[PDB]
Amino acid sequence: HLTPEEKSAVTALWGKVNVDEVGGEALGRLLVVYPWTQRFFESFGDLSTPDAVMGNPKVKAHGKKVLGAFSDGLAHLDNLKGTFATLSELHCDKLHVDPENFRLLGNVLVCVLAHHFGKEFTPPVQAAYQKVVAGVANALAHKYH
């Protein structure tokens, strides 16, 4: 659970986020850093070289959809299990994505936020966003329980 200051600092930073690129960078970095995750995106095409993964227009378009789902999680922090109920069913029952990969993507997003905000992504701001991405990972893995 986020303190009032943590909730304020998170919504504050998020409003400054480029909803068009961050999701793409986060998803792209996941496929380069942990390349076994490329097994769920073979239908996306070019993913061999690192510049191809980032420059891929589908990795960029899909990342935007992933970012949207995190924005939804942020808007409703008290109802994460509910917000990610259809997506938990989708990822767990249809896709068979191991829940460990939700934790990795949340951590890659944290690395992307630090990369875009520099010194504005302070250690308590990161501490707050760690609660968020952990909350989203657990809620997206609820159908496995």
Partner: protein, 140 residues
């Protein structure tokens, strides 16, 4: 670890330079704030912001990693002295190594944007995983 990976780690650590101690201290702080579970290994430490002992420990963790980037191939020999402290007597859960690694990446991403490219990020994450493994090889 491909020959291109070690070029990326050294180039990124080349822009780290004198700021290694500073980056190591921040990574540790990020770990203490984001994951209070890791504080249990330091009840004898002043875990406040700007502590000279977190700054000093930051320098020791950073120098150990500067030593690891200098000794690219076959690391278990250089970090053998370190493997007996962490694993043999203080017995630190290996997940905490994944946590410090991530906190180390968050530090480098914030300070070296132009050098924290996807390729470097993967080379560093693999390097920190290999350091983590070498630091978790001997368990009794």
């Amino acid at each position: 670890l491909s020959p291109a990976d070690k070029t990326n780690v050294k180039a990124a650590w080349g822009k780290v330079g004198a700021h290694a101690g500073e980056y190591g201290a921040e990574a540790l702080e990020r770990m203490f704030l984001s994951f209070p579970t890791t504080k249990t290994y330091f009840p004898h430490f002043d875990l406040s912001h700007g502590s000279a002992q977190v700054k000093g420990h930051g320098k020791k963790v950073a120098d150990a990693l500067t030593n690891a980037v200098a000794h690219v191939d076959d690391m278990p020999n250089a970090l053998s002295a370190l493997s007996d402290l962490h694993a043999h007597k203080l017995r630190v859960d290996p997940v905490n190594f994944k946590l410090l690694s991530h906190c180390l990446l968050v530090t480098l991403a914030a300070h070296l944007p132009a050098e924290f490219t996807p390729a470097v990020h993967a080379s560093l994450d693999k390097f920190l995983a290999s350091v983590s493994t070498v630091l978790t090889s001997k368990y009794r």
